[PDB]
Short mmCIF file of C-alpha atoms and ligand atoms in Angstrom, two decimals:
data_model
loop_
_atom_site.label_atom_id
_atom_site.label_comp_id
_atom_site.label_asym_id
_atom_site.label_seq_id
_atom_site.Cartn_x
_atom_site.Cartn_y
_atom_site.Cartn_z
CA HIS A 1 -0.14 -0.17 0.11
CA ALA A 2 1.15 3.62 -0.60
CA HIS A 3 2.32 5.11 2.73
CA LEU A 4 3.06 8.97 2.80
CA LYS A 5 6.55 9.42 3.31
CA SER A 6 7.01 13.29 3.04
CA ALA A 7 5.08 16.20 2.52
CA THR A 8 5.78 19.93 1.79
CA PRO A 9 4.61 21.81 3.57
CA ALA A 10 6.18 19.31 5.76
CA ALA A 11 4.02 17.79 8.81
CA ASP A 12 3.61 20.59 11.54
CA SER A 13 6.20 22.74 9.84
CA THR A 14 5.61 26.52 9.16
CA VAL A 15 6.44 28.09 5.78
CA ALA A 16 5.13 30.92 3.33
CA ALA A 17 2.59 30.52 0.60
CA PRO A 18 3.99 27.17 -0.86
CA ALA A 19 1.89 27.64 -4.24
CA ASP A 20 1.09 23.66 -4.14
CA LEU A 21 1.36 20.78 -1.81
CA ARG A 22 3.77 17.86 -2.73
CA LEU A 23 2.64 14.61 -1.38
CA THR A 24 5.52 11.65 -1.58
CA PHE A 25 4.36 8.36 -1.33
CA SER A 26 6.10 4.61 -1.04
CA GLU A 27 4.60 3.52 -4.32
CA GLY A 28 2.92 5.14 -7.49
CA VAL A 29 -0.54 6.81 -6.64
CA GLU A 30 -3.50 7.34 -9.16
CA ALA A 31 -4.47 11.25 -9.41
CA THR A 32 -7.95 10.19 -10.75
CA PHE A 33 -9.11 7.87 -8.05
CA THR A 34 -6.87 9.76 -5.10
CA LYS A 35 -8.75 11.97 -2.99
CA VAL A 36 -7.06 15.15 -0.94
CA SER A 37 -9.08 17.44 1.23
CA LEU A 38 -7.50 20.60 2.38
CA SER A 39 -9.28 22.66 5.24
CA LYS A 40 -8.39 25.92 7.10
CA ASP A 41 -9.87 25.99 10.69
CA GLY A 42 -12.40 23.47 9.56
CA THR A 43 -13.83 24.63 6.20
CA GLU A 44 -12.89 23.48 2.87
CA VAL A 45 -10.00 25.11 0.90
CA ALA A 46 -10.72 24.86 -2.87
CA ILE A 47 -8.45 22.32 -4.69
CA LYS A 48 -8.17 23.09 -8.53
CA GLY A 49 -5.71 20.28 -9.44
CA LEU A 50 -4.07 16.71 -8.72
CA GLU A 51 -1.21 15.48 -10.72
CA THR A 52 1.56 12.89 -10.75
CA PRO A 53 4.21 14.39 -13.04
CA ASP A 54 7.07 11.93 -12.98
CA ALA A 55 6.60 8.20 -14.48
CA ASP A 56 6.97 6.28 -11.23
CA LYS A 57 3.76 8.32 -10.06
CA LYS A 58 5.07 8.79 -6.47
CA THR A 59 4.87 12.70 -5.88
CA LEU A 60 1.30 13.81 -5.91
CA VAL A 61 1.07 17.57 -6.62
CA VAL A 62 -2.07 19.27 -5.13
CA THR A 63 -2.59 22.91 -6.44
CA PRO A 64 -4.99 25.07 -4.48
CA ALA A 65 -7.36 27.50 -6.62
CA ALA A 66 -5.57 30.57 -4.45
CA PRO A 67 -2.12 30.96 -3.13
CA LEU A 68 -2.69 30.00 0.56
CA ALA A 69 -3.73 32.48 3.11
CA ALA A 70 -1.53 32.30 6.52
CA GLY A 71 -2.93 29.93 9.05
CA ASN A 72 -3.60 26.32 10.31
CA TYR A 73 -4.26 23.46 7.47
CA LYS A 74 -5.48 20.29 8.01
CA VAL A 75 -4.84 17.71 5.01
CA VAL A 76 -7.01 14.39 4.81
CA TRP A 77 -5.66 12.11 1.91
CA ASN A 78 -7.16 8.73 0.63
CA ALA A 79 -4.84 7.22 -1.84
CA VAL A 80 -5.24 4.62 -4.49
CA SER A 81 -1.97 2.95 -5.59
CA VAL A 82 -1.05 2.02 -9.15
CA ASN A 83 -1.75 -1.39 -7.93
CA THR A 84 -5.36 -0.31 -6.88
CA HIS A 85 -4.94 -0.56 -3.08
CA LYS A 86 -6.60 2.16 -0.83
CA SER A 87 -4.84 3.69 2.14
CA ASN A 88 -5.49 7.06 4.22
CA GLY A 89 -4.31 9.33 6.63
CA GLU A 90 -3.73 13.16 7.61
CA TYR A 91 -1.38 15.78 8.99
CA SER A 92 -1.18 19.45 9.95
CA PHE A 93 0.85 22.52 8.78
CA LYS A 94 0.85 26.41 9.16
CA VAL A 95 1.62 29.14 6.69
CL1 LIG B 101 1.07 6.52 5.93
CL1 LIG B 102 -9.38 12.80 -8.02
CU1 LIG B 103 -0.03 -3.08 0.56
#
């Protein structure tokens, strides 16, 4: 199953407006079947895009509609691997 190895913004780290989130998994994931929910103090923030650029499909680029306002962000992810297995979790970060 796909484990999330690293994010960026990194779990619980603080940053300036990153432009997008990168999620790096232990296996290839499917952009089309994978769900990512980004929320700021408990209301949806709008994701415009999901993509796996490289061909291993191990980094998921999650592009929000706007650049991100400063504050407290919760990511909830439901990955579907290239072999169709479902995993999930969550993490936080701050701008
Ligand atoms: Cl995980
Ligand atoms: Cl999707
Ligand atoms: Cu597995």
